[PDB]
Design a protein around this ligand. Sequence first.
Ligand SMILES: Nc1nc2c(ncn2[C@@H]2O[C@H](COP(=O)(O)OP(=O)(O)OP(=O)(O)O)[C@@H](O)[C@H]2O)c(=O)[nH]1
Ligand SMILES: [Mg+2]
Lengths: 360, 682, 49, 21, 46, 103, 21, 49, 51
Amino acid sequence: KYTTFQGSQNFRLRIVLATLSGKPIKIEKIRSGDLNPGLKDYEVSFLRLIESVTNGSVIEISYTGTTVIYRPGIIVGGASTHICPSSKPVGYFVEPMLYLAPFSKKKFSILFKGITASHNDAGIEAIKWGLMPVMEKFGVRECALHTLKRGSPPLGGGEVHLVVDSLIAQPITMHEIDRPIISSITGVAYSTRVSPSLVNRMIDGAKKVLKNLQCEVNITADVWRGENSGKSPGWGITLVAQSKQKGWSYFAEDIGDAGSIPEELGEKVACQLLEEISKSAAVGRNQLPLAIVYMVIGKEDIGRLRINKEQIDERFIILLRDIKKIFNTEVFLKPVDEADNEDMIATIKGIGFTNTSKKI
Amino acid sequence: PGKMARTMQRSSDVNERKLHVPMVDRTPEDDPPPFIVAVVGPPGTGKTTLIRSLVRRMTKSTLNDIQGPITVVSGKHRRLTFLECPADDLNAMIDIAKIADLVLLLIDGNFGFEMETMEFLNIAQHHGMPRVLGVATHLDLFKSQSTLRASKKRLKHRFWTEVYQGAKLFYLSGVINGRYPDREILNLSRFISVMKFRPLKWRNEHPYMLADRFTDLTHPELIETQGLQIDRKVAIYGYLHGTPLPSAPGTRVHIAGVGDFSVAQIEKLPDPCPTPFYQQKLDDFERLIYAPMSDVGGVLMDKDAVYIDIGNIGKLIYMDNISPEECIRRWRGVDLEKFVPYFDTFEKLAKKWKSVDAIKERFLDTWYELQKAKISKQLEINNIEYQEMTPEQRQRIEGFKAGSYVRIVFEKVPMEFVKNFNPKFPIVMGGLLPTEIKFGIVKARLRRHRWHKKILKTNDPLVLSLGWRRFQTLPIYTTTDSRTRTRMLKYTPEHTYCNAAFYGPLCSPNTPFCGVQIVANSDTGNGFRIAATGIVEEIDVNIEIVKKLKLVGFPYKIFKNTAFIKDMFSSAMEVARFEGAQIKTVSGIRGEIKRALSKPEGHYRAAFEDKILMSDIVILRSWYPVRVKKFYNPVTSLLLKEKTEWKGLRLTGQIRAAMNLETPSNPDSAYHKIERVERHFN
Amino acid sequence: AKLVHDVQKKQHRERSQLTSRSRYGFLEKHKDYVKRAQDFHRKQSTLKV
Amino acid sequence: HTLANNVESKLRDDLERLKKI
Amino acid sequence: FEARQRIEEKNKESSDYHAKMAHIVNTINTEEGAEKNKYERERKLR
Amino acid sequence: PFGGSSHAKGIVLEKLGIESKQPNSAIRKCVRVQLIKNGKKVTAFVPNDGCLNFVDENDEVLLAGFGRKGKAKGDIPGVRFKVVKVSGVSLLALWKEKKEKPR
Amino acid sequence: GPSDVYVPPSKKTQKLLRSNL
Amino acid sequence: SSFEKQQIEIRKQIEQLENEAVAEKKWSLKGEVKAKDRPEDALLTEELE
Amino acid sequence: KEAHKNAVIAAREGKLAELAENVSGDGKRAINYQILKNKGLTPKRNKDNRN
Ligand SMILES: Nc1nc2c(ncn2[C@@H]2O[C@H](COP(=O)(O)OP(=O)(O)OP(=O)(O)O)[C@@H](O)[C@H]2O)c(=O)[nH]1
Ligand SMILES: [Mg+2]
């Protein structure tokens, strides 16, 4: 009712922040200048999921569909199954619940039915191997996701089971100042209804890129054989570099388009991985907001994290503007002492907050 | 050898009695905010006489007509705020127990332990124990040293019982000349000035402060235009305590007996009665009392009249008119739903990645003391990054760190408040949390208070202290039915905890709360008052909650194992709904209800266990749900004029008494003695 | 009787038959039922044998 | 007669409640 | 239909309760009693 | 014993078996603690599930040695303690309603 | 088909989906 | 005053609660509910388990 | 009916007033014995062991 926003910008993030804040919000003039102005099927399903795993939170959408008012309640959770509509994938619906996992009355066991791949949104293995490490370093213990059947575009037929048990008061505050040394690189190429020869082709392209390096590099193959192979054919490949000492992770991934060179896809994922490593500073451009919001929701205490000049960008700016417009909270930034680069230490006081929805 | 053994058990046990559970302090190092002491006791003792004499000694200045808080310096780091609680307002007692940290508890000697004092002791104990120190007054009236000594030891022993043993008390002779014996006044002064404190969760998790100075802001012309009914602007002056309060307007703050008013404007002012180190460092860089609403020197200000005796990427980011694009272009000199970020064309990526040297550049003892070390290290990090840069950090993001005078101005304030305000009552205000602002139903567990006479009743109003608020609601007492359902009771079990659930303002679990009957001095009567104590333990927006109703029926024709039951129902519809179900005759034999009948309209047939007698009464268990009443009423005592004998909802006993009814009673259900004769068979 | 209050040894009391059952006198409890069932089963046992 | 009609209407109401809600 | 549904759910819940109960009681026995017999083997040594 | 001495204090980490459908039994009285001197969790009874309901969580309890005489019906082998004091105050006075758990 | 030839992929993919006279 | 207004609202709410708590209980909240003591067919119309 | 009901109400008022006659003769309210002496939930006992 009070915190006002315009347009369709960053809708999921704004809703998640509204839930964590308790401040009632109204977002209006949603894609008004369009031939089909209003909301989307995936967006309304997202709101349905929000009501499902919340309790007593009131959500209404004006008949014009360009003005949504949200009055948040509490975050119950529980165990349920959602059927993601065709246009958008399970990782896209999972990331917000991934944000909301560790602070709920009943643990999270959600079965998502549908598609598990997109150039747009994060793959299941991508989200696992990238985000699970970040949240667990912040202080969650049992968060995992299993794959009963894996879908593909555009038929879907995939089943993912998110089980998150760790209910924490707050993530432990973080003070990361340095640059982790990359320990090794692993990855995986998955194939649905297509050739192991194709798998080997893409892995050959990847290792051709990665032969310039000397530390450990391993990528596994997953032919999702048989009944749970979904319906449409497809394939994809993911790559993650790891720093065992502090245990950090950075990653990039892709799927195979229609009429594409699997070797090219290999050099693809390799090149995005390398480039993200290049632009990284103790954290990766896509998991930036995840760690940011965790360290913000941390307890009443300043927290420190190294970030990159290049990592600072439009998406960072809009995240900062939104998080300030919600929490009335501003992030201090000070340059690194070392001159060889211009890394920036971000400090921010995690707000006084508790897992007041917990069962004691 | 033997001494070695004995002293090692000494060492082990004493360390094992030394250690504790760690919790953070957040507390101010540079400038401690004042510590709060409250004179607490019954009205016929002379607390005023005590406050006057003690403050005069400490400050080296006399004073008459004390009222409201009064703040003084002692030590080279010590400033204290003295509060004389009234012996009338149970609510004021409650607020003092919420906020104050040293309680100067003064008790009659000619008469021992009035229950008001005992109740303050209980409620402080409940909301988090503040350091207590008692003084036995009126020892001079005892006309024999025998009685004086006996009562001395008696008092010391009861006190030692009800608070930690060893808690010495100070004996106070008499008020000769508006004064207390100076030497024992030194005892008190030195002691409480060298007192040591503990961290408590309430203090150290919510930013709280007592209101020092009271002013109103309204255009007088606005007043006559509106007609005195216009909510009045209000300005409060005070210090800070415990948790660093935020610095930007737009947060919510409770005020006792007032309501819940958001912060409109706030400004930081240097204190009026500063530390001697503060003064000396002031002078080094360049080269006592305070009690706003009570008299100081020889002058007291009224509302207007007075009485006197005769004698930069960061800022670019945080600016709004700038588009983020113009931010970035100014700085080097899209939405997020697309999860993977932007990139470069594939050929340029590949060619620039043919070189990889730039990427090999990046590429390859007591546990208690241990977590106390983590706490200390985290706070020292806080300190260094706090000192890093003041004008943005200190002023804004650190909020207003504790120990800094503040003036805050608000709107929508009751005309009645500003008009019938009196200084004699304390006035408190502390930060609300999101959980403490959202509402719902609290699931708590509580017991009657053990010195109380009567047991509480479900759906009977009940005031309670919980969070800064203090308010009356209608609980519902539920006992889990050996952990299957949530059956509702109809009374509290008379000597144990039991679950309760009621609508109210939410708050974090594992939080103590303490509930009371009438607050009105008019009806305090002669008994104890504090009635329930418990912990709020979870919060929600709805709960399943059950009451047990058993449908009674009778048999009217009996075969071996079969029966026709005649009054558990009245319609074949109904019996068809309930058929194939499970019943147990009062005798304790099971059976199932099986088929409706026709020519009688509500009678059915059951297949039992053995030949069920005509002289029985069959029953069928069933769970109805119950709906929690949503009554909610903050007390607003200080909004009221007389500031006591506030009356919310009355209790069923005095409701029946008032409207002159008689208690419902199921006669045949009332108990009676049964004499079953001895039975024989053929 | 280790660590229990007598007010935990309450003594729940004994009800009475519903009054409108003046005619069908004297409600039974389980102890009356066990006397009845035991006697009937002796009658059976011997009559079977 | 009219009593039969009233009972029928009541049946309609109760049955609609029980079979719909 | 309601009868079949209710009996199914009640059976599942009671069996699951039992399984958790044995899981717990047995883990206390194993862990704690093992370390206790460790300490007792310790005490008899002296 | 647990080291050298006769009593040890620590932190109530959770109340194992809050949900024992059959009240006042082994686990029903079984709470668990964290010995602070060792920073390590360990199991310990409470007497009288009433006192169970007294002690809740994060509560500076102080443990003593259980010391069964002989072999009863169900009391679990391995649980080796009894709580004595909670957050300052002593559970016999509590369960006898002499004092109230202060905080 | 290397992974198809891999019977050890049973355990491997299981972990991958999980994590005198 | 708006304070007086909310006092009026709370007051009326108060007497409604008093009368509602002193009146007869609802049959479904009672115990030993029965054919003669109910209003008829309520067990169909309602939902209990 | 009215005679009986007024009789029971009168009994109510009489008992209530007789309780109320023990109100404080002063404005100061005395400690209670149960809380002066604080002996909680004893068993039942005997004069032998008393002596
Ligand atoms: N015997 C004795 N009487 C005292 C002592 N101190 C104060 N008094 C009496 O108590 C009276 C003081 O009353 P007040 O100071 O107004 O009472 P109070 O307890 O401060 O409560 P307020 O009236 O609300 O301030 C004096 O008239 C004294 O006769 C003492 O140490 N011994
Ligand atoms: Mg006084």
